[PDB]
């Protein structure tokens, strides 16, 4: 019982020395996130308007659009109200295909500005900290697992 309640790796999100998260993407995951969210000038598929992150993923898999193409996507984001309820906001944001694809694993309740930049190690650490502060424990562990999977996959694809 004490192992499950205290020593589980899921209960050990934050470091004891300081409030910074102790589990953090590193090495391959960081490189994958940095490859996805970085942009390039005159990449294939630049300037196309997308109906959502799923269309960005479809164009990436089809080879029609590059991962660094600066496109315009329709993103729906949620922000917590005064009572804590989630209210959606839909707008067209200047972003890339990689950031749009990455937005699919971001949980509800976080701004789109977290992924709308070249994500380094510090950026991912801050994103995980923000997710923990806003949502809680289980959303943070799910988000960390998804980030690790996506980083590994796109670091493999990056070559």
């Amino acid at each position: 019982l004490e192992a499950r309640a205290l020593m589980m790796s899921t209960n050990n999100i934050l470091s004891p020395a300081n409030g910074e998260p102790i589990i953090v993407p590193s090495q391959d995951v960081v490189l994958g996130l940095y490859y996805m969210t970085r942009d390039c000038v005159n990449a294939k598929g630049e300037g196309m308007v997308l109906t959502g992150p799923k269309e960005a993923e479809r164009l990436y898999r089809s080879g029609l659009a590059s991962l660094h193409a600066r496109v315009k996507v329709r993103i729906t984001e949620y922000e917590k109200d005064a009572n804590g309820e989630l209210v959606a906001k839909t707008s067209l944001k200047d972003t890339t295909v990689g950031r749009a694809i990455l937005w699919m694993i971001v949980p509800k309740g976080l701004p789109y500005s977290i992924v709308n930049q070249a994500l380094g190690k510090k950026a991912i650490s801050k994103m995980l900290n923000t997710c923990y502060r806003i949502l809680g424990l289980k959303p943070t562990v799910i988000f960390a697992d998804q980030i690790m999977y996506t980083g590994f996959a796109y670091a493999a694809r990056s070559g």
Binding site: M48, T51, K54, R58, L59, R61, S62, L64
Partner: protein, 206 residues
């Protein structure tokens, strides 16, 4: 999950066949599925995409994007023209299109425009063609060329996890992340992709 989202799993597959079956089905669903969607549109108010109309909340880019989001089924016409004239106060909805026998709309409650002033109104005609896959308007090259999403799939993804049967540990399990636009059942879309792939190699089956 939904009428457009479904999960199918095949656990007893041999080692290495997950990345074969899932990849082949994903490619066929993404690039080879037949379907009909909006590919062209002409608006009286706006001559070009860069020019912006007055009296409508949504810009021309938003109108083209909503037209892309529209999912349509055509019975027996390769290319069909749908016309929409709207008046009054309220959002422009896909149900406002004049009904045609050969043309059906899966989701009537699809907003194309939002009307701001009752003085201004738009009369628009959209061209729907049957095709396969996703062809961008840039490659296609006052006619507004909008991207056409013929393939009914909205998102397809596969993940390979090891599943162990008694005495065998290298067997692979395949799970499918399948998302459709509502034109056809995602399971039936998987069936169509499998049928297409099987018919491709019929000339080699012993």
């Amino acid at each position: 999950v939904s009428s457009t989202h479904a999960k199918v799993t095949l656990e007893p597959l041999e080692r290495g066949f997950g990345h074969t079956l899932g990849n082949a089905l994903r490619r066929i669903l993404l690039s080879s599925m037949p379907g009909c969607a909006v590919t062209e549109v002409e608006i009286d108010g706006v001559l070009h995409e860069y020019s912006t109309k007055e009296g409508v909340q949504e810009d021309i880019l938003e109108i083209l994007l909503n037209l892309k989001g529209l999912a349509v089924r055509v019975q027996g016409k390769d290319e069909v023209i749908l016309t929409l004239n709207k008046s009054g106060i309220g959002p422009v909805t896909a149900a406002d299109i004049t009904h045609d026998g050969d043309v059906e709309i899966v989701k009537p409650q699809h907003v194309i425009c939002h009307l701001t002033d009752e003085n201004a109104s738009i009369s628009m005609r959209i061209k729907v063609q049957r095709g396969r896959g996703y062809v961008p308007a840039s490659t296609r090259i006052g006619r507004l060329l909008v991207d056409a999403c013929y393939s009914p799939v909205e998102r397809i993804a596969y993940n390979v996890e090891a599943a162990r049967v008694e005495q065998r540990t290298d067997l692979d399990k395949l799970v499918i992340e399948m998302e459709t636009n509502g034109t056809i059942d995602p399971e039936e879309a998987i069936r169509r992709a499998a049928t297409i792939l099987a018919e491709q190699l019929e000339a080699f089956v012993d």
